[PDB]
UniProtKB/Swiss-Prot annotation, chain B:
Family affiliation: Belongs to the WD repeat PWP2 family.
WD repeats: 4-43, 47-89, 90-129, 132-171, 194-233
Domain of life: Eukaryota
Role: Part of the small subunit (SSU) processome, first precursor of the small eukaryotic ribosomal subunit. During the assembly of the SSU processome in the nucleolus, many ribosome biogenesis factors, an RNA chaperone and ribosomal proteins associate with the nascent pre-rRNA and work in concert to generate RNA folding, modifications, rearrangements and cleavage as well as targeted degradation of pre-ribosomal RNA by the RNA exosome.
Residues shown, of full length: 410 to 715 of 919
Quaternary state and interactors: Part of the small subunit (SSU) processome, composed of more than 70 proteins and the RNA chaperone small nucleolar RNA (snoRNA) U3.
Protein name: Periodic tryptophan protein 2 homolog
Native organism taxonomy: Eukaryota, Metazoa, Chordata, Craniata, Vertebrata
Gene: PWP2
Localisation: Nucleus, Nucleolus
Swiss-Prot record, chain E:
Cross-link named Glycyl lysine isopeptide (Lys-Gly) (interchain with G-Cter in SUMO2), sites: 33
Highest rank taxon of the organism: Eukaryota
Subunit structure: Component of the small ribosomal subunit. Part of the small subunit (SSU) processome, composed of more than 70 proteins and the RNA chaperone small nucleolar RNA (snoRNA) U3.
Protein name as catalogued: Small ribosomal subunit protein uS7
Phosphoserine, modified sites: 128
InterPro entries hit by this protein: Ribosomal_uS7, Ribosomal_uS7_CS, Ribosomal_uS7_dom, Ribosomal_uS7_dom_sf, Ribosomal_uS7_euk/arc
CDD domains, per database record: uS7_Eukaryote (cd14867)
GO biological process, alphabetically ordered: cytoplasmic translation; regulation of translational fidelity; ribosomal small subunit assembly; ribosomal small subunit biogenesis; translation; translational initiation
Localization, UniProt: Cytoplasm; Nucleus, Nucleolus
GO CC list: cytoplasm; cytosol; cytosolic ribosome; cytosolic small ribosomal subunit; extracellular exosome; focal adhesion; membrane; nucleolus
Keyword set, alphabetical order: Acetylation, Cytoplasm, Isopeptide bond, Nucleus, Phosphoprotein, Ribonucleoprotein, Ribosomal protein, Ubl conjugation
Curated annotation (Swiss-Prot), chain F:
Domain of life: Eukaryota
Bias kind Basic and acidic residues: ranges: 31-41
Subunit structure: Part of the small subunit (SSU) processome, composed of more than 70 proteins and the RNA chaperone small nucleolar RNA (snoRNA) U3.
Disordered: annotated span: 16-41
GO biological process: endonucleolytic cleavage in 5'-ETS of tricistronic rRNA transcript (SSU-rRNA, 5.8S rRNA, LSU-rRNA); endonucleolytic cleavage in ITS1 to separate SSU-rRNA from 5.8S rRNA and LSU-rRNA from tricistronic rRNA transcript (SSU-rRNA, 5.8S rRNA, LSU-rRNA); ribosomal small subunit biogenesis
Organism this protein belongs to: Homo sapiens (Human)
Protein name per Swiss-Prot or TrEMBL: rRNA-processing protein FCF1 homolog
Known role: Part of the small subunit (SSU) processome, first precursor of the small eukaryotic ribosomal subunit. During the assembly of the SSU processome in the nucleolus, many ribosome biogenesis factors, an RNA chaperone and ribosomal proteins associate with the nascent pre-rRNA and work in concert to generate RNA folding, modifications, rearrangements and cleavage as well as targeted degradation of pre-ribosomal RNA by the RNA exosome.
Recorded GO MF terms: RNA binding
Gene name linked to the record: FCF1
Swiss-Prot record, chain H:
Subunit structure, as described in the record: Part of the small subunit (SSU) processome, composed of more than 70 proteins and the RNA chaperone small nucleolar RNA (snoRNA) U3.
Tissue distribution: Expressed in heart, placenta, liver, skeletal muscle, kidney and pancreas. In ocular tissues, strong expression in iris, sclera, ciliary muscle, ciliary body, retina and optic nerve.
Protein name per the record: WD repeat-containing protein 36
Role of this protein: Part of the small subunit (SSU) processome, first precursor of the small eukaryotic ribosomal subunit. During the assembly of the SSU processome in the nucleolus, many ribosome biogenesis factors, an RNA chaperone and ribosomal proteins associate with the nascent pre-rRNA and work in concert to generate RNA folding, modifications, rearrangements and cleavage as well as targeted degradation of pre-ribosomal RNA by the RNA exosome. Involved in the nucleolar processing of SSU 18S rRNA. Involved in T-cell activation and highly coregulated with IL2.
Lineage: Eukaryota, Metazoa, Chordata, Craniata, Vertebrata
Extra remark: Depletion of WDR36 mRNA in cultured cells causes apoptotic cell death and consistently associates with a reduced 21S rRNA and delay of 18S rRNA maturation.
Residues of the full protein shown: 464 to 550 of 895
Gene: WDR36
Localization per record: Nucleus, Nucleolus
Length: 49, 306, 290, 122, 190, 44, 94, 87, 139, 51
RNA sequence: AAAAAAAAAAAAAAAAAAAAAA
RNA sequence: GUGUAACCCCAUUCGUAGGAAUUCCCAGUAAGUGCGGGUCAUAAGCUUGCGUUGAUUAAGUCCCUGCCCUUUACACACCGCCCGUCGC
RNA sequence: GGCCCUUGCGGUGCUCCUGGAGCGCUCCGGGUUGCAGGUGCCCGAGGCCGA
């Protein structure tokens, strides 16, 4: 895992603006639906074959 | 000269009293010959086809014993009857050597599982002892009185034990003393090869105060056992037509493409008679026969002491 | 030695895999040999490759070992050497169990019984292999009566599990005396199925080759998958009339397991046969008889 | 083969030959003489020490296996061998291993968390 | 360096006044240990327990008697307390006291029996030194155990007084009585 | 600087001075590039 | 139904003597018969050119084969035979 | 006495110094059992090599000049200022 | 430059101890505790055996830490002794001359061989051998 | 059962070049994460970017 | 197929990344 | 031992067991102690594994109680005939 | 320990005698060199594999 990072070495995280998260949330939600859609179509092809 | 054996003889021994000579061979047979009538009157073989590596006979001469290359077990026969008395088991790996105690009639055998085992023959309860070692054992010898035992190990140490008490009396470090030289075809240097070679022949003096050790070198080292110091070093030979004699190979023979040993190898093997064969270390079929390595196969000291 | 034992086992299992192929390879050879010896059409399955079988047939001779059988490899030294049997018990034995283990020593010629203290199961198998022990017996008990028996052939031989039913010991019977202790004759009766031939082999090889004139008799009789152990000695008072006097323990056996490995390898060894009691036809089936 | 099958000479000669080939490992099982025509020049190459080191998983590449014997990291019993042309018997293949005080055996023992300076260096 | 038992009892000053028992009492410089707990195999071979130091043998034989077997540390502390009490009371080296007690307690001749159902007869016979040491240690341990039983006195004091009396040669000790009666019966059966 | 497990320089089996039948193998691994277009012949 | 003794290829000198005494039935007479049989069988081997030719091929091959194994093979058990010693002083063997 | 491999001091002979005057010669027996040294005052001393304990002392008629030991025979040669040689 | 350190193993039954020896001032610790704090103290002298054999002058130049796991009390004590002695011998071989290593080793061997070489106890009994002596059994 | 059988023929002397750089931890072969190996100049640069 | 590790996202999901079985 | 520690150790207080017969046991063995599992049989106040602490005596004779065999490979050396009965 | 235009630090380019394996050179001498029988050698790929 190697989770630990020392206090001196660690860097502050990125702080996203509200507009960026709205765009970023749109893609992941879109990708989840699209990935789900393809996987369902995979089983229909295999059953018919 | 006796030619009854078909393959090579690995070990040989005289009986303590009679003029009888006992040999063990790769034939799988241990044969006894008499010097009064010049005949092979007794032959011992194992029930199982196995090859023997050494022979040991009791001081009384009633018991004959041998060890194997592969079956990992010591066979003991009776001299007068000629039947297989017993098979002693317990070792793991081949048996490097055997020796009877001259005065007590017990058998000491060293093996490659870092152990030396003591077997009691005339004992009703079959008492056995084990002596554990740091590295693999190669040879075992008793002092003439029989109260002290010597084991050579693969890390080139000679350890002196007390057999009756199973306690280590002393040790001798001998790696540095065995000056060993590089062969013509060796890629590695002398030191790297020496780090992997140990003593393989041991012999006590007649009085027992000194020990003689030898191996794959032109030197035999005589040590003082009690002080654990090297009293003397004997040079066996100075012939430089024998392989591995000198530690540093001559720089004069080097060229850009190497020392080019195979040209001289073909010139030497031009003797004919047989055809050199790949993978044979020793013999006529061995390619490296014209210039063999220098090796002291065995040492022995006169019972007279002169 | 440890590498030798591991190396030999892989050869043993590997040969077992191809024993079916070699039997099939051999069986098709005689049909062609029968086809050539008596002039007749070669069977169409042998119509191809027929010349190849003839060449190997011409190579066939008495010198070759022949087709391999896993039973022969397991019991290699059955006839040539006398077996060496070691008998031990479970941890913390009862008084009556130590009597039973004392009696099995006398039944088997040359057997030795060693005290089981804190010895782990793995170490005993290692020590027995090192000293050339051929066979190992382990016996269990319940409330002072022996109830389980395990027979193991040390050189990666089969391990057979048994359960005892009706045990009567000599220590119960007063003033019997001393046993004959000679090399015994063996009587095997009732074993007809293929598995029955397997089980009778394991029990027979626990004993050495006897003498012709020996008067000691040991009987293994099978009746509805229960093996009866009986021990007798006979005296011929006159021709055709014989008297039987019973000596030694009397007990019954029921086999339920044969494993290819030794009793150190419960976790890896395969099962040659097991008793399955929850099958619908379990009550109405027998396996040691046909 | 051409000799009669029921001849004592053939039987003794057949058993002697297959017993020597099986020991060297050139023949898989001590079966019939049919196995004896399967031996080739390659059958000898498979019994050399460098390819045996490949079989025992001590080495993975044949150039690496040949490299080790020349650098003296492998011993057959107490003897250390440097000749790649060295046919090893079925018995002797059980006793090929790293020579003591070799850097490879140090790496193996370090990996297994079993490295003690006392025994190795001594 | 000098090796002293329990850190305070030296072994150089110890001397044995019996030539017969010199080879079977291990107390001298080679057999000197810091504690009577070495975890060796002294029962492996015949005659090997002659190499085990006498204090460790006393510790082992004190474990068998009147105790659940396998508790060696308790016996070690019992021996330590007994040595401390002996030094306090007598003022000399307890090792010398133990050696003298073992020398004195050992019978010199015993009686071998030939026995039938009706009557038993005896012949006086010699005793080997190893059996002398074994019987001496056994008698001292048994005497200490019997003195300690059903009394307000811990085993350490009884052991200490037993060794004191045996080393003095007094007849108040169990081992001296047993030895005297054994030699008396052997004398009567000559 | 020293080399071990050396072998003499010999002809390789993949040399094009050999004929195509004699040549061992082209020893070429093909990877479908993600940017590469997929083209197929599918009769209507 | 007992364990049946299997047939050994190895013959010790204790059952070799038994066989000769068994069929014939003084000791010199027993040895005389067997020695003649041994020589008669040996002459048969030399009179077949094919067996002679095959035996020489085995010799050349086997000496090659054991050398490759550095003399590590399964040995042949020694067969008991009868040999002729003659009554003359032991100097001749030296 | 110094170790050759590491160069670490391994002790000294005598409580403070071996001899009153200068040390002319030192010698070690072949078996590493006896160490013999000389002084300008005319004394010849023999020491144990291991535990560094004095054994014996010999007075010389004249001051020793040079000193060598023949190890295997155990023969010691002394040259003195009075031109004589003592063995 | 680089630190001189040696780690060695000691074993006794199921008890295993790992000892690390480096250049130091004489500190010996077992599981973070001094030697005198190890229980049971009845065998404390068994735990102090090497030092008393060799003196403080040899241990004054090294720092040793031992981590021991498994087994009981006595097995752990024996493992700790073996690990300490082996670690000291290895260090004086590696970073001191060989003469001192030889002298320390033969002193330790002369006292008790268990301090350096562990001897496992295996199964050896009369029962494995047949009845009677090796000779004279069935002629 | 498949895994336990494989342990039977395991050869302790086996050697692989991955073994040199990787050490077992309690018997488990953990692949430790690679180091980043920053140098002081870049380490000073990240802090200036952070502020 | 599966046990992991590294990122983001939503009130868990998603992309890459290794080993093991087959 | 992956199916959704006691024992021991230090210190404190208190304070005077099983006949006659019979069975078993030789080294990590006898004896004490704890901790798991229930594994296609057997097992419930039982059965089996695992570890910890770890001894006394003995290494040899046929005297009693018995068991297994025998009394027809010519080195040197040693040794130099088992007996009785009834049938054919 | 010693060092004073220094370094617990590092690198280069030439020289350093072949055992058989640079033989043959004091003088003298070197000119007239004054068809027995031979038939060789080479030609095998199957894995108790590893990745
Ligand atoms: Mg118990
Ligand atoms: Mg127990
Ligand atoms: Mg009671
Ligand atoms: Mg319990």
């Amino acid at each position: 895992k190697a989770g630990k990072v020392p206090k001196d070495r660690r860097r502050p995280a990125v702080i996203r603006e509200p507009h960026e998260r709205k765009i970023l949330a749109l893609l992941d939600a879109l990708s989840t639906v699209h990935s789900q859609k393809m996987k369902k179509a995979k089983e229909q092809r295999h059953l018919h074959n | 000269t006796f030619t009854e054996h078909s393959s090579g003889v690995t070990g040989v021994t005289f009986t303590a009293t009679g003029y009888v000579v006992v040999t063990s061979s790769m034939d799988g047979t241990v044969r006894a010959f008499d010097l009064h009538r010049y005949r092979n009157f007794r032959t011992f073989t194992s029930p199982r086809p196995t090859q023997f590596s050494c022979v040991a006979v009791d001081a009384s001469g009633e018991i004959v014993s041998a060890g194997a290359q592969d079956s990992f077990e010591i066979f003991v026969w009776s001299m007068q009857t000629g039947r297989l008395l017993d098979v002693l088991s317990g070792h793991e790996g081949p048996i490097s050597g055997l020796c009877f105690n001259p005065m007590k009639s017990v058998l000491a055998s060293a093996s490659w599982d870092k152990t030396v085992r003591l077997w009691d023959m005339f004992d009703s309860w079959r008492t056995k002892e084990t002596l554990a070692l740091t590295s693999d054992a190669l040879a075992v010898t008793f002092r003439p009185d029989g109260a002290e035992l010597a084991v050579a190990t693969l890390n080139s140490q000679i350890t002196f034990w007390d057999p009756e008490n199973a306690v280590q009396t002393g040790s001798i470090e001998g790696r540095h003393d065995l000056k060993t030289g590089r062969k013509e075809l060796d890629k590695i240097t002398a030191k790297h090869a020496a780090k992997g070679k140990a003593f393989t022949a041991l012999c006590y003096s007649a009085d027992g105060h000194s020990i003689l050790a030898g191996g794959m070198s032109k030197f035999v080292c005589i040590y003082h056992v009690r002080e654990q110091i090297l009293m003397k070093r004997f040079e066996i030979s100075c012939n430089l037509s024998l392989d591995a004699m000198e530690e540093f190979l001559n720089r004069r023979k080097m060229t850009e493409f190497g020392n080019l040993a195979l040209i001289d190898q073909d010139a030497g093997q031009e003797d004919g008679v047989a055809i050199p064969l790949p993978g044979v270390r020793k013999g006529d079929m061995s390619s490296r026969h014209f210039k063999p390595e220098i090796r002291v196969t065995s040492l022995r000291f006169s019972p007279t002491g002169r | 030695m440890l590498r030798r034992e591991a190396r030999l086992r892989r050869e043993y299992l590997y040969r077992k895999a191809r024993e079916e192929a070699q039997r099939s390879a051999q069986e098709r050879k005689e049909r062609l040999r029968r086809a050539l010896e008596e002039n007749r059409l070669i069977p169409t399955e042998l119509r191809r490759e027929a010349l190849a079988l003839q060449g190997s047939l011409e190579f066939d001779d008495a010198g070759g070992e022949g087709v391999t059988s896993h039973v022969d490899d397991e019991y290699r030294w059955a006839g040539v050497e006398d077996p060496k049997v070691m008998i031990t018990t479970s941890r913390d034995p009862s008084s009556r169990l130590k009597m039973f283990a004392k009696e099995l020593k006398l039944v088997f010629p040359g057997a030795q019984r060693m005290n089981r203290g804190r010895h782990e199961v793995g170490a005993l198998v290692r020590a027995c292999k090192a000293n050339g022990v051929t066979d190992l017996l382990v016996v269990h008990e319940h409330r002072g009566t022996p109830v389980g028996l395990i027979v193991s052939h040390l050189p990666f031989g089969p391990t057979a599990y048994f359960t005892l039913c009706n045990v009567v010991m000599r220590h119960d019977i007063p003033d019997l005396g001393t046993m004959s202790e000679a090399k015994p004759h063996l009587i095997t009766h009732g074993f007809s199925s293929r598995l029955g031939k397997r089980v009778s082999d394991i029990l027979r090889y626990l004993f050495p080759v006897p003498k012709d004139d020996s008067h000691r008799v040991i009987t293994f009789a099978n009746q509805d998958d229960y093996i009866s152990f009986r021990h007798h000695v006979y005296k011929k008072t006159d021709h055709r009339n014989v008297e039987l006097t019973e000596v030694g323990p009397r007990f019954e056996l029921k086999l339920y397991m044969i494993r290819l490995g030794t009793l150190e390898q419960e976790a890896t060894a395969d099962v040659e046969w097991r008793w399955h009691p929850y099958t619908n036809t379990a009550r109405k089936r027998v396996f040691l008889s046909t | 083969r051409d000799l009669p099958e029921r001849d004592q000479f053939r039987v003794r000669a057949s058993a002697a030959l297959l017993d020597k080939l099986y020991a060297l490992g050139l023949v898989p099982t001590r079966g019939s003489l049919e196995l004896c025509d399967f031996v080739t020049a390659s059958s000898f190459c498979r019994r050399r020490l460098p390819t045996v080191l490949l079989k025992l998983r001590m080495a993975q590449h044949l150039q690496a296996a040949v490299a080790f014997v020349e650098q003296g990291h492998v011993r057959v019993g107490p003897d250390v061998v440097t000749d790649p042309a060295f046919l090893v018997t079925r018995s002797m293949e059980d006793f090929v291993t790293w020579v003591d005080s070799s850097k490879i055996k140090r790496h193996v023992l370090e990996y297994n968390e079993e490295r003690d300076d006392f025994d190795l260096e001594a | 360096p000098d090796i002293k038992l329990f850190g305070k009892w030296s072994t150089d000053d110890v001397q044995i006044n019996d030539i017969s028992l010199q080879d079977y009492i291990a107390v001298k410089e080679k057999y000197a240990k810091y504690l009577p707990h070495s975890a060796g195999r002294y029962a492996a071979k015949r005659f090997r327990k002659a190499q085990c130091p006498i204090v460790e043998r006393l510790t082992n034989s004190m474990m068998m008697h009147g105790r659940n077997n396998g508790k060696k540390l308790m016996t070690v502390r019992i021996v330590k307390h007994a040595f401390e009490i002996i030094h306090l009371l007598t003022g000399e080296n307890p090792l010398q006291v133990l050696v003298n007690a073992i020398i004195n307690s050992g019978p010199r001749e015993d009686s071998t029996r030939i026995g039938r159902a009706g009557t038993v007869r005896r012949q006086a016979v010699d005793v080997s030194p190893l059996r002398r040491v074994n019987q001496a240690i056994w008698l001292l341990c048994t005497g200490a155990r019997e003195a300690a039983f059903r009394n307000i006195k811990t085993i350490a004091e009884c052991l200490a007084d037993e060794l004191i009396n045996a080393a003095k040669g007094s007849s108040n000790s169990y081992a001296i009585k047993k030895k005297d009666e054994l030699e008396r019966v052997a004398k009567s059966n000559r | 600087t020293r080399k071990y497990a050396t072998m003499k320089r010999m002809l390789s089996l993949r040399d094009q001075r050999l004929k195509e039948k004699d040549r061992l193998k082209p020893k070429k691994k093909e990877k479908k590039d993600p940017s590469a277009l997929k083209e197929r012949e599918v009769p209507q | 139904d007992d364990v049946v003794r299997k047939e050994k290829p190895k013959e010790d000198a204790y059952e070799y003597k038994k066989r000769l005494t068994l069929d014939h039935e003084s000791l010199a007479e027993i040895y005389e018969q067997e020695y003649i049989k041994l020589n008669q069988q040996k002459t048969a081997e030399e009179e077949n050119p094919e067996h002679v030719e095959i035996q020489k091929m085995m010799d050349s091959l086997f000496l090659k084969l054991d050398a490759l194994s550095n003399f590590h093979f399964i040995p042949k058990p020694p067969v008991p035979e009868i040999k002729v010693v003659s009554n003359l002083p032991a100097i001749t063997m030296e | 006495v110094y170790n050759m491999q590491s160069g670490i001091h391994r002790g000294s002979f005598g409580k403070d110094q071996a001899h009153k005057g200068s040390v002319r010669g030192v010698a070690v027996d072949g078996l590493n059992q006896l160490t013999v040294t000389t002084g300008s005052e005319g004394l010849l001393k023999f020491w144990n090599f291991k535990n560094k304990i004095l054994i014996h002392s010999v007075s010389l008629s004249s001051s020793p000049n040079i000193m060598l030991l023949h190890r295997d025979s155990g023969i010691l040669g002394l040259a003195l200022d009075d031109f004589s040689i003592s063995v | 430059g680089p630190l001189q350190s040696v780690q060695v193993f000691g074993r006794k039954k199921t008890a295993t101890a790992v000892a690390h020896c480096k250049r130091g001032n004489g500190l010996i610790k077992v599981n973070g505790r001094p030697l005198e704090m190890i229980e049971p103290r009845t065998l404390q002298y068994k735990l102090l055996e090497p030092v008393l054999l060799l003196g403080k002058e040899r241990f004054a130049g090294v720092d040793i830490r031992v981590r021991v796991k498994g087994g009981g009390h006595v097995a752990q004590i024996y493992a700790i002794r073996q690990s300490i002695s082996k670690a000291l011998v290895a260090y004086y071989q590696k970073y001191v001359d060989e003469a001192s290593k030889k002298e320390i080793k033969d002193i330790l061997i002369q006292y008790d061989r268990t301090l350096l070489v562990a001897d496992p106890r295996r199964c050896e009994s009369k029962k494995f051998g047949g009845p009677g002596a090796r000779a004279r059994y069935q002629k | 059962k498949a895994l336990r059988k494989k342990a039977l023929e395991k050869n302790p002397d086996e050697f692989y070049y991955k073994m040199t750089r990787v050490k077992l931890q309690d018997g488990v072969h953990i692949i430790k994460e690679t180091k980043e190996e920053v140098t002081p100049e870049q380490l000073k640069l990240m802090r200036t970017q952070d502020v």
